[PDB]
Design a protein around this ligand. Structure first.
Ligand SMILES: OC[C@H]1O[C@H](OC[C@H]2O[C@H](OC[C@H]3O[C@H](O)[C@@H](O)[C@@H](O)[C@@H]3O)[C@@H](O)[C@@H](O[C@H]3O[C@H](CO)[C@@H](O)[C@H](O)[C@@H]3O)[C@@H]2O)[C@@H](O)[C@@H](O)[C@@H]1O
Ligand SMILES: [Ca+2]
Ligand SMILES: [Ca+2]
Ligand SMILES: [Ca+2]
Length: 132
């Protein structure tokens, strides 16, 4: 037994899958469900710092489970949870700008950016880590 599956990353009781292939946002949601996970929902500040560092180093635009598709301007996580005011400090400068209609969030550089949901990007899945 292993806390996390092969190629996954462990951090604070959860396993994260950093994809090596690309998908649009909706298909990323499905990809995660197919492996018993969810497109990453950041539930804490320590988690954000950890993920941002890995994403920045990967130098890849990467989807997270956050969108304002249902109501422009109101960002909600895929589990139905609302984005908190304390997490809003993570957007890059000038973001979110909804330029050309951007309703999905991605890790970009050292922060977050909103981009077109139909764009294919890497993604991160999250599921709980097993204890053995
Ligand atoms: O600090 C520097 C900067 O470095 C990284 O890249 C910056 C740049 O990345 C994205 O554009 C990439 C290319 O996209 C097309 O191929 C061309 O436009 C080409 O000229 C670009 O280089 C993109 O995220 C961009 O952000 C702007 O566009 C997006 C998409 O329309 C929009 O959502 C943003 O609000 C903004 O207008 C970004 O500047 C990244 O690590 C950056 O985070 C970093 O700041
Ligand atoms: Ca919109
Ligand atoms: Ca939007
Ligand atoms: Ca943007």
């Amino acid at each position: 037994c292993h806390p996390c599956p092969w190629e996954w990353t462990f951090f604070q009781g959860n396993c994260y899958f950093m994809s090596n292939s690309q998908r649009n946002w909706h298909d990323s949601i499905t990809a995660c469900k197919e492996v018993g996970a969810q497109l990453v929902v950041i539930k804490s500040a320590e988690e954000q710092n950890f993920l941002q560092l890995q994403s920045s180093r990967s130098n890849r635009f990467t989807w997270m489970g956050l969108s304002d598709l249902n109501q422009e301007g109101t960002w909600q996580w895929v589990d139905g949870s609302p984005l908190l005011p304390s997490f809003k400090q993570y957007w890059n400068r000038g973001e979110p700008n909804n330029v050309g209609e951007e309703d999905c969030a991605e890790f970009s550089g050292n922060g977050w950016n909103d981009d077109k949901c139909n764009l294919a990007k890497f993604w991160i899945c999250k599921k709980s880590a097993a204890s053995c």
